[PDB]
Structure 1
Amino acid sequence: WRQQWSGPGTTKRFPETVLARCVKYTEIHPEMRHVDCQSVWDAFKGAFISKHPCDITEEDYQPLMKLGTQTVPCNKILLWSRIKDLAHQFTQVQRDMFTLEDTLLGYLADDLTWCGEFATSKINYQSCPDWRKDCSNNPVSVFWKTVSRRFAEAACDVVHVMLDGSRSKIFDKDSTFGSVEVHNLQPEKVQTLEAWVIHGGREDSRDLCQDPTIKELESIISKRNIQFSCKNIYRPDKFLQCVKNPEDSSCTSEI
């Protein structure tokens, strides 16, 4: 009966895009220069080619995880939930801190779609499974759960997280951040999780650190024996300007 999936198909020129991103990343990051980008592509394709794209497992991605092993300075991590573009803008100006997309494997996959099919060795450019409409264990969703659990496990000292203060659930306990990332923060390594709650422009300077879902996050973090801190980012434009030039007279010292 199944004639196609509900989601968009594999990114056009996905193979070229993965290989090119690997070459660019290993140029910019001489600490990953040991990587063989063709081997990385072959491991990536091997995770999902010739497999039914609702049957993918974390073990499928183990060859890729091995080749893309990277040590990230554990006290320099910025996590995010539903506000990736501002998190990226932040690490473009605070260049010693890392989101997952600043790691080799996150950089390879960012904003892409991919899948295969059981019958053949071909990449499916026509359609790929949507996580909700078709199946959760799809090539893209399984990749991100695999790599983000390792990223969260590795974080230490003070960990920061950006949250979207415009959403109905500023912290959604069932989001990928709330499931995979929060519950892989290890208390033996992590002292504090500090949330940066980004105002949208319709929160009227309310203190969103008192929001019910932030109180939920505080309780979950407290139960993992980690300290919780929360800061409102009232003006995300001015915040980035001040990260770039900390002496600009528009700067606050709220963060």
Structure 2
Amino acid sequence: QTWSGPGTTKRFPETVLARCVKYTEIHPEMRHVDCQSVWDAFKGAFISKHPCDITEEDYQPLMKLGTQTVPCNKILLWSRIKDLAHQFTQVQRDMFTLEDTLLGYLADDLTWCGEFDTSKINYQSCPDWRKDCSNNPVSVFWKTVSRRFAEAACDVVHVMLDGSRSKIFDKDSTFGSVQVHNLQPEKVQTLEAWVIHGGREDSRDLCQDPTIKELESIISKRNIQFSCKNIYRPDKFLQCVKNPEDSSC
């Protein structure tokens, strides 16, 4: 092991390519996209580069090719609750997480890195953001696209949070550290948090949690309004999303 983190996901190239093909077949706005070109831009960002010396500039060709206009008022951010967030947008096709854009979809759940001294993809190990270095191919990609997604948002921006974390709002998460600080005060009217409950019996009003007050305070300073909703039963939440024209929802 050079690095502490998992190596590049097996079949990474085929996977990105196949994801690109699938995405561009499904999403008509991205029909102009040449997936081979996308892949080549993606590779170019990290191949032959030291995996602790990646910059946002490295991903600019990919950002260019992956240019996508998402409805700015229909953005769902999330933190620590990836699965519910995606289940939600799979059904509420009106709304978009980052992983519902081409670039986020290409990269979701994947790891990748290269090596400085060669042009090969490193399937053995990749830098861990913590135990190794922060400017790695994965962390730099996610910070860049997460920032740009946040910059794109307008009107009411929603964020799904895991109410079972004990830092429900975590300043150190990508949401907390990058996206909160890149919501444009000129465009964003309200950030509304949906705090997802995840455990036994009748729960507190988690919108009163100190970390939520922290989030509210941060965003208020940025001249953006804050709203918060408890989602007490995520299972019933999704069921209501799947069939909304139904009493009890």
TM over 0.5, shorter chain: yes
Summarize deviations over 1:131-190 as a string: whole Å, max 9, x none: 111111110000000111000000001000000000010001121111100000011111
Displacement of 1:83? 0.5
Partner of 1:25: 23
Partner of 1:155: 153
Displacement of 1:247? 2.8
Percent identity of equivalent pairs: 99
| Contact map agreement 1:166 1:203 (CA 8 A) in 2 | no
What's the TM-score once normalised by structure 1's chain length? Answer: 0.96
| Contact map agreement 1:52 1:116 (CA 8 A) in 2 | yes
Partner of 1:225: 223
| Contact map agreement 1:166 1:202 (CA 8 A) in 2 | no
Displacement of 1:203? 7.2
Partners of 2:121 and 2:77 in 1: CA distance:
31
Displacement of 1:10? 0.6
Change (3 A) 1:65 1:203: farther
Summarize deviations over 1:177-209 as a string: whole Å, max 9, x none: 111000000111111001000001147321001
Q: In angstroms, what is the RMSD of aligned CA positions? A: 1.0
| Contact map agreement 2:164 2:198 (CA 8 A) in 1 | yes
Question: Which SS does the other structure have where 1:161 is aligned?
Answer: strand
Partners of 2:243 and 2:27 in 1: CA distance:
24
4+ runs deviating over 6 angstroms: none
Aligned residue among 167, 170, 178 for 2:168: 170
Displacement of 1:103? 0.1
Partners of 1:8 and 1:174 in 2: CA distance:
21
Displacement of 1:125? 0.8
Question: Which SS does the other structure have where 1:174 is aligned?
Answer: coil
| Contact map agreement 2:79 2:160 (CA 8 A) in 1 | yes
Summarize deviations over 1:59-110 as a string: whole Å, max 9, x none: 0000000000000000110000111100000001101110000000000000
Question: Which SS does the other structure have where 1:101 is aligned?
Answer: helix
Partners of 1:114 and 1:202 in 2: CA distance:
38
Partners of 2:151 and 2:173 in 1: CA distance:
17
What's the TM-score once normalised by structure 2's chain length? Answer: 0.98
